[PDB]
Amino acid sequence: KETAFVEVVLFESSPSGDYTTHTTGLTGRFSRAGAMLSAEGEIVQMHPLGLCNNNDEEDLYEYGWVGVVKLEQPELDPKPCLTVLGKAKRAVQRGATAVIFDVSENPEAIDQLNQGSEDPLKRPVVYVKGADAIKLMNIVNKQKVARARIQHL
Amino acid sequence: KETAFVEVVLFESSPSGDYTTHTTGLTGRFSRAGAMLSAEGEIVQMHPLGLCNNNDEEDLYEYGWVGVVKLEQPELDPKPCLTVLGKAKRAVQRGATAVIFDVSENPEAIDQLNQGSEDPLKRPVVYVKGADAIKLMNIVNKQKVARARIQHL
């Protein structure tokens, strides 16, 4: 639906106490399964098979993380553990302040999500594609310790 | 100037992996020294004498914290280390994603801040008073580990 401006911040401390930052802006869109809210947190890269309640608890994630999930070619998962819409549920259920899906290689996700007017989540679910997704992932993949800032309207 | 809706979240983990939350909403206003942006982070209680470059570096704060400063009666600080407007600068300079001043006992702060159209900060500066400030502080003081969510418009 409405636009989801997203900033990604890489940050190093300097000896002089102060932080340095690089920062990259992405456009994204807000799903109807999520709340159309601003939100901000440390980015966590969730494995699409890593958001599975097949396993009870994975590791510790401190409350308030931005969960980023790079979606797979649907063809390559016939037998999943969780819906696109119930993966979001669990991350949120587990501290995520926002969820971000790179649906580049699975655009049907959009609909499943955007036809989610049955019990939507308190926290935002955002999807990205195109050149906007390329960046994110090139940042998440290559990076480690990065903070996302998702703004609404 | 414009309103700054602020949520304060207390959060505990449950054995079952999931978080529980209590949450309290405050109204605040956005200073002209800050950016009128949404922002979110772990709340840190900065001492008004604790935001002093009299001391070079204090302790480690991970980038992205919401700095909360409860302002003193001006009468009780004739000889300060930093302006209201340069205290904000340093927190921001040191990772703060937002700054929050309880100006209850020092409303002049407002002006000093709101007459800050000379080189304003990338990150938001919010002030609160009244029943809105009472809450925050009653939460910060009594609490430990709490997350703030500041929304614009």
Author numbering:
A (entry chain C), B (entry chain C): 53 to 205
Provide excerpts from the study.
Rspo (R-spondin, also roof plate-specific spondin) proteins are evolutionarily conserved from fish to humans and have well-documented roles in a broad range of developmental and physiological processes resulting from enhancement of canonical and non-canonical Wnt signalling. Direct extracellular interaction with Rspo proteins inhibits ZNRF3/RNF43 activity. Here we report a molecular level analysis of the ZNRF3/RNF43 ectodomain structure and its interactions with Rspo proteins.
Two β-sheets (comprising β2, β1, β7, β3 and β4, β5, β6 strands, respectively) splay apart, accommodating an α-helix (αC) at the open edge; two additional α-helices (αA and αB) pack against the β4, β5 and β6 face of this distorted β-sandwich. A disulphide bridge, conserved across species, links two structurally elaborate loops, β3–β4 and β4–αA. Comparisons of ZNRF3ecto structures for proteins crystallized in several different crystal lattices, or for crystals containing multiple copies in the asymmetric unit, consistently highlighted an acidic region (N105-E114; residue numbering is for mouse sequences unless otherwise stated) within the β3–β4 loop, the short αC–β7 loop and the extended β1–β2 hairpin as flexible elements of the fold. Our crystallographic data provided independent structures for multiple copies of the ZNRF3 ectodomain in eight different crystal forms. All but two of these crystal structures reveal an extensive interface (average interface area 992±109 Å2) formed between two ZNRF3ecto polypeptide chains. This dimer is conserved, and pairwise structural superpositions yielded r.m.s.d. values of <1.3 Å (for 275 equivalent Cα pairs). The β1–β2 hairpin forms a second interface by reaching out to embrace helix αA and the β3–β4 loop in the opposing subunit.
